[PDB]
């Protein structure tokens, strides 16, 4: 019994990375999650590396 | 009989919070079985209340 | 019967739950309490 389909993915997402044997970017765990802050989170995330 | 006819105001009344964002209702032990009727039909009344 | 009734009064236990349905039967006594200070401090 959950709410919606990403109640559901996010569940089993974090069930799978809490044992560690497979790993899962944190991107998806964003996407996948319920957050107000998904947009920031997300462009915090995809942004590419220094200029430097 | 009365005493035992009522439930047990003593473990009861705790709402837990998963990662989903939905309030699943904690019934712990026994007791709040009886009392899930009543719980339900106070949480259909505020759906129908949030959808009007 | 009027020692049972009150929230509080054995074995240690049975104190901690009657306490315990006290608090719970209390709830909308405090709940009361609570809406009076909001509007206080609405007002």
Same mark, same amino acid.
């Given at each position: 019994?959950?709410?919606?389909?990403?109640?559901?993915?996010?569940?089993?997402?974090?069930?799978?990375?809490?044992?560690?044997?497979?790993?899962?970017?944190?991107?998806?765990?964003?996407?996948?999650?319920?957050?107000?802050?998904?947009?920031?989170?997300?462009?915090?995330?995809?942004?590419?590396?220094?200029?430097? | 009989?009365?005493?035992?006819?009522?439930?047990?105001?003593?473990?009861?009344?705790?709402?837990?919070?998963? /990662?989903?964002?939905?309030?699943?209702?904690?019934?712990?032990?026994?007791? /709040?079985?009886?009392?899930?009727?009543?719980?339900?039909?106070?949480?259909?009344?505020?759906?129908?209340?949030?959808?009007?």
């Amino acid at each position: 019994d959950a709410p919606t389909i990403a109640a559901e993915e996010f569940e089993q997402l974090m069930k799978l990375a809490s044992t560690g044997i497979v790993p899962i970017p944190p991107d998806v765990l964003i996407e996948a999650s319920s957050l107000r802050n998904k947009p920031k989170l997300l462009e915090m995330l995809k942004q590419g590396p220094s200029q430097e | 009989e009365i005493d035992l006819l009522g439930p047990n105001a003593a473990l009861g009344g705790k709402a837990e919070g998963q /990662m989903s964002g939905r309030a699943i209702l904690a019934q712990q032990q026994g007791g /709040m079985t009886e009392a899930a009727t009543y719980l339900d039909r106070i949480r259909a009344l505020s759906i129908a209340v949030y959808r009007s």
